[PDB]
């Protein structure tokens, strides 16, 4: 509809502080009015917030300005496979976090490539490498996204899924570190290189469907699990911090996450998990996601983890 002017500075001040630049005519105005509408709806979410209406509150981030094209690409990058085509095989403390025993690499950014497929395999696989070598290394997504392709059902930028990922490597014998092959955020040529092999896979497990129960066992005695949630909501994309919880969630997966831990927040149990929207997103680029609610999001739907 039509911009607000008394909120012409803060649009100002708000582009800076993430550096939007729009270069196309007229992307300006359009960014402006999603802009709008996405404060307006952490306004409001926070006000409740502050009368204790939720266990998280939300803050306008980076993707504040996402228009409906973005948002499309940011929920197709999960190519989940059909429950029943899941290869399903596979006493314990009261919080995990896997980043206190160094087994998780820094937040990466995806930008606007649907790669999160790639970044929740390789993150998955960084934690068994750290715990097979003692070395800590970040693993190229970009070496998924231009190698692990059709003959594993992804696509790319275009979307994939974390076990296909993890059964690349494991033909390839191999998969670079992301240091010598960058991510790009782009379908480009393979361009695996065996002088670089960061990590190996030997095989991979998959969990049962919906058993929370399960994948904190997992996520306690093996390390990170890589799995899907419902992320095609706007109280997700503007998520702050606290724990997350929509009672609009579904089972339907859409994005690809690292759980690499869990706990509680005042009673509240939650799943640690890393995103891939950088720093900047929830806190300090991690979402804590409600744990025993009814399969939450469908965080324990697809469920797995690798093994070098």
């Known amino acids: 509809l039509h911009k607000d002017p008394t909120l012409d ?10 550096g939007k630049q729009y270069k196309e005519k007229n992307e300006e105005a ?4 999603i802009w709008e509408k996405n404060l307006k709806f952490v306004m409001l979410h926070n006000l409740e917030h502050s009368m204790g209406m939720h266990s998280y509150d939300l803050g306008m981030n980076h993707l504040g300005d996402m228009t409906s094209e973005e948002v499309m690409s940011l929920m197709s990058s999960l190519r989940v496979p059909s429950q029943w085509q899941r290869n399903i095989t596979y006493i314990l403390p009261d919080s995990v976090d ?9 937040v ?15 993150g998955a696989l960084e934690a068994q490498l750290k715990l097979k070598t003692g070395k800590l290394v970040s693993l190229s997504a970009q070496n998924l996204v ?22 690349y490597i494991i033909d390839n014998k191999g998969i670079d570190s992301d240091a ?9 040529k393979c361009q695996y290189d065996s002088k670089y092999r960061a990590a190996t896979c030997s095989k991979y497990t998959e969990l049962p469907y919906g058993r929370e129960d399960v994948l904190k066992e997992a996520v306690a005695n093996k390390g990170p699990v890589s799995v899907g949630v419902d992320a095609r909501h706007p109280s997700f994309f503007l998520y702050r911090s606290g724990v997350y919880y929509e009672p609009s969630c579904t089972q339907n997966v859409n994005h690809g996450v690292l759980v690499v831990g869990y706990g509680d927040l005042n009673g509240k149990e939650y799943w640690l998990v890393k995103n891939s929207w ?5 806190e300090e680029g991690y979402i ?21």
């Open 108 to 122: 990466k950014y995806q930008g606007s490539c649907g790669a999160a497929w790639a970044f929740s395999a390789v």
């Open 98 to 106: 896997w980043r206190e025993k160094g087994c998780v690499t820094e």
């Open 288 to 308: 804590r996601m409600a744990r025993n609610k009814g399969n939450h999001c469908g965080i324990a739907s697809f469920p797995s983890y690798p093994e070098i």
């Open 278 to 282: 950088g720093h900047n997103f929830g």
């Open 30 to 33: 359009v960014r402006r009015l």
């Open 146 to 167: 231009d190698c692990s392709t059709e003959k594993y059902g992804n696509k790319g930028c275009n979307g994939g899924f974390m076990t296909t990922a993890f059964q």
């Open 9 to 18: 500075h803060h649009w100002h001040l708000w582009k800076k502080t993430y």
């Open 180 to 188: 010598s092959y960058p991510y790009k955020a782009m379908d480009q």
